[PDB]
């Protein structure tokens, strides 16, 4: 159920009634779109302001609702890049304090810094848990859990099946990354789907894979 756009740059595919994956090329990058009864919520926006705008615009039109909220899963350019777009449209950009301080330190506008280690948000009907499992791909990476769907957005912490290595480890803690992955496996013992930061949606298996990439 791939609804692409004008250019193939942006693309969304349904995971269920209310959860879609968004993917933009910048190397393809995933996030979620949550159709809740109070607006659209993005897990992660995009590479930059341009693609973040195109994304918001494409979902607002399709779903007939405003993007009200974004969850930023770490402060790297590809995740925080459209932050200026979010703040200036009045889109709440949720992040941990650490993601925000990293965003600030890298010259970006700051997201809210409102997420704790475990934070439980509700958007209309939609329950979203954010989970900081520890350092991994970055020091600040969080996962997002949709407890009504048992869906985990692992973000960059989680490598797709097709990832044969760890990608960008310049900011990674390859020693803590295994434990952080394990922390996810323990918190979420029954996962229906996992969305890696890049690549094709999988299950629990993507976390086992990522563990293996770390040996």
Marked catalytic residue, from 22, 76, 94, 198? 76
Residue 55 near residue 42 (C-beta atoms within 8 A)? yes
According to CB under 5 A, which one of 24, 48, 110, 156 is a site residue for Zn ion? 156
Between 76 and 94, whose beta carbon lies closer to Zn ion? Answer: 76
What angle (nearest 5°) sits at the alpha carbon of residue 114, between those of residues 113 and 116?
Answer: 105
Active site residue 78: yes
Comparing CB distances to Zn ion, the nearer of 74 and 209 is: 74
168 included as an active-site residue: yes
* Paired tokens of 1: 């159920």
Q: Measure the CA angle with vertex 25, ends 48 and 67; round to 5°.
A: 55
Residue 141 has φ and ψ, to the nearest 5°, of: -45, 130
* Rounded CA separation 186/180 (Å): 10
Nearest distance from residue 141's CB to Zn ion, in Å? 7
Structure tokens at 51: 């693609």
Q: Give residues 69-88 in contact with Zn ion (rule: CB under 5 A).
A: 76
Residue nearest to Zn ion (CB): 76
Taking the least distance from each CB to Zn ion, the nearer of 129 and 156 is 156
| Closest distance to Zn ion from the beta carbon of 171 (Å) | 7
The token pair that represents 121 in the structure block:
């948000």
140 near Zn ion (CB under 5 A): no
Backbone angles phi, psi at 171, to 5 degrees: -110, 20
Determine whether 76 is an active site residue. yes
Q: How many residues does the chain have?
A: 215
Find the catalytic residue in 18, 35, 74, 140.
74
- Burial readout 107-137 (b: 16 or more C-beta within 10 A, e: otherwise): ebebbbbebeeebebebeebbbbbbbbbbbb
Closest to 77 (Cα-Cα) out of 40, 139, 26: 26
Catalytic residue flag (residue 74)? yes
Task: Select from 6-14, 21-29, 90-98, 152-160 the region that touches Zn ion (CB under 5 A).
Answer: 152-160
CB nearer Zn ion, residue 125 or residue 168: 168
Q: How many residues bind Zn ion (CB under 5 A)?
A: 2
Site string for Zn ion, 5-24 (x = CB under 5 A): --------------------
Residue closer to Zn ion (CB basis): 40 or 115: 115
Which positions touch Zn ion (CB under 5 A)? 76, 156
């Amino acid at each position: 159920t791939v609804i692409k756009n004008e250019t193939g740059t942006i693309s969304i595919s349904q995971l269920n009634k209310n959860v879609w994956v968004h993917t933009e090329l910048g190397v393809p990058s995933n996030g979620l779109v949550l159709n809740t009864s109070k607006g659209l919520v993005l897990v992660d926006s995009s590479w930059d302001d341009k693609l973040t705008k195109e994304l918001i615009e494409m979902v607002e039109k399709k779903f007939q609702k405003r993007v009200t909220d974004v969850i930023i899963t770490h402060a790297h350019a590809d995740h925080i890049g459209g932050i200026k777009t979010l703040k200036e449209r009045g889109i709440k950009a949720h992040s941990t304090a650490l993601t925000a301080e990293l965003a600030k330190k890298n010259g970006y506008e700051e997201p809210l810094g409102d997420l704790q280690t475990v934070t439980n948000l509700k958007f209309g009907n939609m329950k979203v848990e954010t989970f900081y499992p520890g350092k991994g791909h970055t020091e600040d990476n969080i996962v997002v859990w949709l407890p009504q769907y048992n869906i985990l957005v692992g973000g960059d912490l989680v490598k797709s099946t097709s990832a044969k290595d760890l990608g960008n480890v310049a900011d990674a803690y390859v020693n803590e990354w295994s434990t952080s992955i394990e922390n996810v496996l323990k918190r979420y013992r029954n996962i229906n789907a996992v969305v890696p930061g890049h690549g094709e949606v999988g299950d629990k298996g993507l976390l086992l894979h990522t563990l293996d990439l770390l040996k």
